[PDB]
Structure 1
């Protein structure tokens, strides 16, 4: 695999190795707020993170992943548009070189500085690798980041980045509480889509929170000091690791809120 975010290997190129890039259920999308329908039949999201076990943080050359023990229902997402129980596997972010870009979803064409993806897989499939092959395999909680006041519960993340600067580096990351990444409100939009990274598999129920979290400018500047490259290689700052909005096609975005 040789994909990335650069002009030579970025999203406009992905379709050659991953033809599903041009499919019917691709993510991210622009969320047109006047067209999204309130669906009174959507439940409240159930985010049950009390028993989450974070383990490790890894620079994978595209983003950094905070990984969880998904060998048991500890940290699970249920309810909302979902049937069944979905285990948290990892979260990661997408961000820009500057605060005007970075999110993958957009809201009435507005871009946020960053977007957090909490990735969960459906336990009916047993493992992540099986879940990505199924149309209801993943549930991804997306959360926008704007820049303003610092998010206190992000700082433990930002503080360790210095130690995973380059691709393949990992560090212990136990006893991180992901509840500290959530806004107050769980109001959400939902639609059927895909992973936003190759292999771009069409296996995701998207749940995108309406309320952004605020992070400081120092927090997000520290994200932009990471590297896409390996140790000792030509430094390529890990910035603009976002896929742009894709066609909505034959899809309905639903709102949980009037």
Structure 2
């Protein structure tokens, strides 16, 4: 699987039939159709920068992984009664500034999107156990809007020169990714899925209503990552967002 014409989102269902399921992500959030819910608590994140571990070029994207052997870095509140442990963050982007986010809001596409993913350590004892469970994963999504350079992205962008090609990895330490979140954590939430294979319907989504910025030159750094292995002809990572998926009667809740 990939994002190209032959192996890309419109084709995933052949190998992963869940692609046509009832809880697929991402979605267009129609704000006239959201339900304000007063039982939602505020989102609380508390991440220890000592859990930052490694950055990895995975061919279609890059990931920053965290140690997840204990509850040093956690998400709580919102819709959740369980504590969720941070395991990774990453970004999705498009070929031009005009699209690239996964979630859209009233049809509006943003240039990129940040995902901060966690797993339910109250109920399960590893990512691998949690990942396919309906209550197993919690992902914060932040829409990234093209504009002024975002200096909080610095350490991440400066790391990419060490992982230019597929499979490269390097230590990435002492970093707290709550520094990337917008100053307001007002959110929407809905039950959904991983946005790429294996597409498990295991994710409770927390989508920030406030965007964070990114510059056109910062987006170019993502797009200049290479999907080929060292020594091969360069194939830039132009894009890696999945199209929005039908709600199938799900309700998006608003914390605000």
TM-score range relative to shorter protein? over 0.9
Partner in structure 1 of residue 137 of structure 2: 138
Aligned equivalents of 1:59, 1:238: Cα separation in 2: 10
Aligned equivalents of 1:51, 1:147: Cα separation in 2: 27
The Cα of 1:108 is off from its aligned counterpart by 0.5
Q: Please say if residues 25 and 194 of structure 1, whose CA atoms lie closer than 8 Å, have aligned partners that are also in contact.
A: yes
The Cα of 1:50 is off from its aligned counterpart by 4.1
Matched, 1:249 2:244: no
Partner in structure 1 of residue 225 of structure 2: 226
Q: TM-score with structure 1 length normalisation?
A: 0.96
Matched, 1:161 2:169: no
Q: Please say if residues 49 and 174 of structure 2, whose CA atoms lie closer than 8 Å, have aligned partners that are also in contact.
A: no
Aligned equivalents of 2:50, 2:73: Cα separation in 1: 5
Partner in structure 2 of residue 62 of structure 1: 60
Q: Secondary structure at the match of 1:125?
A: coil
Partner in structure 1 of residue 170 of structure 2: 171
Aligned equivalents of 2:155, 2:132: Cα separation in 1: 34
Partner in structure 2 of residue 6 of structure 1: 4
Aligned equivalents of 2:179, 2:42: Cα separation in 1: 19
Q: Secondary structure at the match of 2:32?
A: coil
Aligned residues: 255
The Cα of 1:233 is off from its aligned counterpart by 2.1
Structure 1 gap ranges (5+): none
Q: TM-score with structure 2 length normalisation?
A: 0.97
Partner in structure 2 of residue 196 of structure 1: 195
Partner in structure 1 of residue 40 of structure 2: 42
CA RMSD of aligned residues (A): 1.0
The Cα of 1:53 is off from its aligned counterpart by 1.4
Aligned equivalents of 1:112, 1:146: Cα separation in 2: 5
Listed as ranges, the matches of 1:16-27 within 5 Å are 16-27=14-25
Aligned equivalents of 1:70, 1:25: Cα separation in 2: 27
Partner in structure 2 of residue 73 of structure 1: 71
Matched, 1:214 2:213: yes
The Cα of 1:82 is off from its aligned counterpart by 1.1
